Every structure is written in structure tokens, then in C-alpha cells.
Design a protein around this motif. Structure first.
Motif: not given
Ligand SMILES: CC(=O)N1CCc2c(c(Nc3ccc(-c4cnn(C)c4)cc3F)nn2[C@H]2CCOC2)C1
Length: 126
Positions: A43, A67, A39, A34
Motif C-alpha cells: 500500500q 499508494g 494489500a 487496495w
């Protein structure tokens, strides 16, 4: 065009569990992937409306992003590590097929994939 609904992160019909391997993957996501330099494109679901990418969801019929993966892990959506690994593979492959070989974003995905694969190699005993 409009954005599709994001992938589900819970499902009352799908068996759920918490395991040592899945907790390891969650650690890897939160502590390392993350926060990675690369990233940022990965995300959240690709917002084709905000980015004005009319072709994105014409090309990508199995969207996946970190996510969503993170939320699935947090919600015990997966039964095993392989299901989570498959979602990462989908995420990386999506990038490779929407974009073109050697594109900057593709090189970013390749670097993150390399790192992810190193982490999978260290997946704990159970
Ligand atoms: C994963 C994937 O294949 N994608 C298809 C191509 C793509 C993707 C993003 N993503 C993205 C872009 C910007 C920001 C951003 C900028 N500022 N802030 C606050 C957020 C966040 C993003 F996630 N850009 N592009 C293209 C657009 C132009 O060149 C790269 C996703």
C-alpha cells in the motif's frame, strides 16, 4: 541507512490525461486491490528505515507500490493503461526479486498479480 524519496506522482514535463481505461484501473485499485487481504505489504513505499531492511534499496532500484500507483491515477500522471500496467508489473517483480521463491509474501504478490491480470482482461473498449 535512509529511505529514498518516493516515486514522483506528478511531473510538469510529462503529458497527463484522464481516460476511460485509466478510470477503470483506478476503480479496480480503490474497490478491489487496495482492500484485498494481501494489500498490506504493497500500500505504501517500502519503509526500509521503519522495517530495518538495509538491503531493500540496494536490491530494488525501481521501487513501486500501490499508494504511488493510486496517486498517479488520481493525478492523471499516466497517458495510457499500459503505463499503469507497467508500474504494477514492477511492483510484483520487485517482490519476486527481493524475496525468495515460495516465501509467504511472494505467494501474496502472486495472488494479487493473478487477480490484477483477470481485471486487465476486462479493460473496457477505449
Ligand atoms: C513488498 C516487499 O517485498 N517488502 C519487503 C519485505 C517486507 C515488506 C514488509 N512490509 C510491511 C511489514 C509490516 C507492516 C505493518 C505491520 N503493522 N503495521 C501497522 C504495518 C507493513 C508492511 F508494509 N514486511 N516485509 C518483511 C519484514 C518481515 O517479514 C516480511 C515489504
Amino acid at each position: 541507512s535512509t529511505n529514498p524519496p518516493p516515486p514522483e506522482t506528478s511531473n510538469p514535463n510529462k503529458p497527463k490525461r484522464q481516460t476511460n481505461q485509466l478510470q477503470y484501473l483506478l476503480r479496480v485499485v480503490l474497490k478491489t486491490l487496495w482492500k484485498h487481504q494481501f494489500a498490506w505489504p504493497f500500500q505504501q513505499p517500502v519503509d526500509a528505515v521503519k522495517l530495518n531492511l538495509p538491503d531493500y534499496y540496494k536490491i530494488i532500484k525501481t521501487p513501486m507500490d500501490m499508494g504511488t500507483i493510486k496517486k498517479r491515477l488520481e493525478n492523471n500522471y499516466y497517458w495510457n493503461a499500459q503505463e499503469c500496467i507497467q508500474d504494477f508489473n514492477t511492483m510484483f517483480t520487485n517482490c519476486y526479486i527481493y524475496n525468495k521463491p515460495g516465501d509467504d509474501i511472494v505467494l501474496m504478490a502472486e495472488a494479487l498479480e493473478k487477480l490484477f491480470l483477470q481485471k486487465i482482461n476486462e479493460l473496457p473498449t477505449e
